[PDB]
Amino acid sequence: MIEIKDKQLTGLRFIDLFAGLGGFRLALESCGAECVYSNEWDKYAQEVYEMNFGEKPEGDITQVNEKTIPDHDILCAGFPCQAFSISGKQKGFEDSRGTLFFDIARIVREKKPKVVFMENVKNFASHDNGNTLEVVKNTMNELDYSFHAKVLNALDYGIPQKRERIYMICFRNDLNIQNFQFPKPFELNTFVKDLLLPDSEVEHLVIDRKDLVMTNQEIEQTTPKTVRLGIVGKGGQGERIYSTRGIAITLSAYGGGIFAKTGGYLVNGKTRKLHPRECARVMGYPDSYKVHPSTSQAYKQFGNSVVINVLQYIAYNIGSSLNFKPY
DNA sequence: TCCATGCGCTGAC
DNA sequence: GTCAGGCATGG
Numbered sequence: 001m002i003e004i005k006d007k008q009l010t011g012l013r014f015i016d017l018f019a020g021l022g023g024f025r026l027a028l029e030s031c032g033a034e035c036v037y038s039n040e041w042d043k044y045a046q047e048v049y050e051m052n053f054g055e056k057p058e059g060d061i062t063q064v065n066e067k068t069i070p071d072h073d074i075l076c077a078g079f080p081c082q083a084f085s086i087s088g089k090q091k092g093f094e095d096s097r098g099t100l101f102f103d104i105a106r107i108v109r110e111k112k113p114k115v116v117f118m119e120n121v122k123n124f125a126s127h128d129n130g131n132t133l134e135v136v137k138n139t140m141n142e143l144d145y146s147f148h149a150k151v152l153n154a155l156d157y158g159i160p161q162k163r164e165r166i167y168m169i170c171f172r173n174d175l176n177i178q179n180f181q182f183p184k185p186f187e188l189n190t191f192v193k194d195l196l197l198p199d200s201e202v203e204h205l206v207i208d209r210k211d212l213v214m215t216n217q218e219i220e221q222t223t224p225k226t227v228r229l230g231i232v233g234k235g236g237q238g239e240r241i242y243s244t245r246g247i248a249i250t251l252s253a254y255g256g257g258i259f260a261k262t263g264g265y266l267v268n269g270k271t272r273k274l275h276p277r278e279c280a281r282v283m284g285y286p287d288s289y290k291v292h293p294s295t296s297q298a299y300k301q302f303g304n305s306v307v308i309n310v311l312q313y314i315a316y317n318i319g320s321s322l323n324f325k326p327y
Numbered sequence: 328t329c330c331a332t333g334c335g336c337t338g339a340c
Numbered sequence: 341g342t343c344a345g346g347c348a349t350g351g
């Protein structure tokens with residue numbers, strides 16, 4: 001994550017729904033905002049969240065009485081994407097994990113915050129011929145909010161990872177916000193190799209497959225894209241090796257393959273998965289953030305997480321708009 | 328709400 | 341054609 005000099009969100013309160021690792025909290029707090037409520041039902045996610053923030057999030061949001069939630073100015077929610085990912089069944093709203101948005105609507109209807117800040121996968125904008133997005137837009141409009149949505153790629157915001165997500169920002173109408181804008185992209189100057197740990201700390205992650213097949217030669221010039229160098233097995237998900245001179249592929253939470261949830265990388269002549277810490281760095285998490293003791297749960301959590309830097313730029317712009325109150 | 332891995336198709340080219 | 345992006349099942 002980066003450092004924010006002008007704390008645009010100072011004095012504002014927000015709630016951390018579907019908290020997970022707490023990426024939204026890190027981002028909003030870096031801007032001076034105060035967290036007054038968090039919710040997450042995963043046991044292991046609750047443990048890591050408590051390790052880094054000192055409090056346990058409330059459980060299953062579907063069984064929480066919205067009136068119970070503390071007044072707040074901004075509602076943050078990176079809700080479940082498994083039902084919308086192109087890698088799954090795309091049942092969307094017909095999936096038990098695809099209805100959480102309505103829980104969000106339910107909370108908004110009661111608390112009416114100034115801002116609703118949501119996140120999901122890129123496919124959310126196209127899912128079901130765009131009906132899924134329209135449903136969200138209309139729901140928010142009927143709740144008396146403006147709706148701003150855009151897919152952003154982490155690689156355009158200083159992070160060496162290809163992670164395209166849809167960001168949806170909504171301002172309550174009585175605030176008359178007409179100047180909100182998604183941050184503009186900029187040149188990437190950091191690559192996977194620059195975030196790697198020393199070889200002496202990841203020897204155990206090295207994988208030596210006899211069926212490795214180099215499909216491309218290692219490049220010598222860094223580039224803002226994923227560069228596949230080869231594959232193992234049939235080359236499916238988790239069986240693809242990439243160059244550290246390029247950017248990391250998107251981290252997976254439920255993915256498989258021999259290089260499961262991180263993908264494989266060519267490092268100093270050897271192929272290996274990424275270490276939890278490296279996963280934290282590709283997600284913009286500061287080295288001071290404590291990862292969950294179970295590496296398996298750590299990979300899962302980062303796979304589901306958001307990129308801190310992208311949320312920071314957006315949070316700053318939300319604040320910039322809320323603070324423009326000329327006479 | 329355990330950990331591991333071979334898929335087996337989908338969306339955007 | 342090229343390639344990035346959870347489910348099912350075994351222990």
Ligand SMILES: Nc1ncnc2c1ncn2[C@@H]1O[C@H](CSCC[C@H](N)C(=O)O)[C@@H](O)[C@H]1O
Nearest residue numbers: 018020021022023040041042060061078305
């Ligand atoms: N009914 C529910 N109540 C509370 N949390 C839920 C839920 N259904 C799913 N979740 C949680 O929703 C999260 C979606 S992924 C969220 C990532 C998070 N924003 C980050 O910063 O790391 C997961 O951690 C998952 O366990």
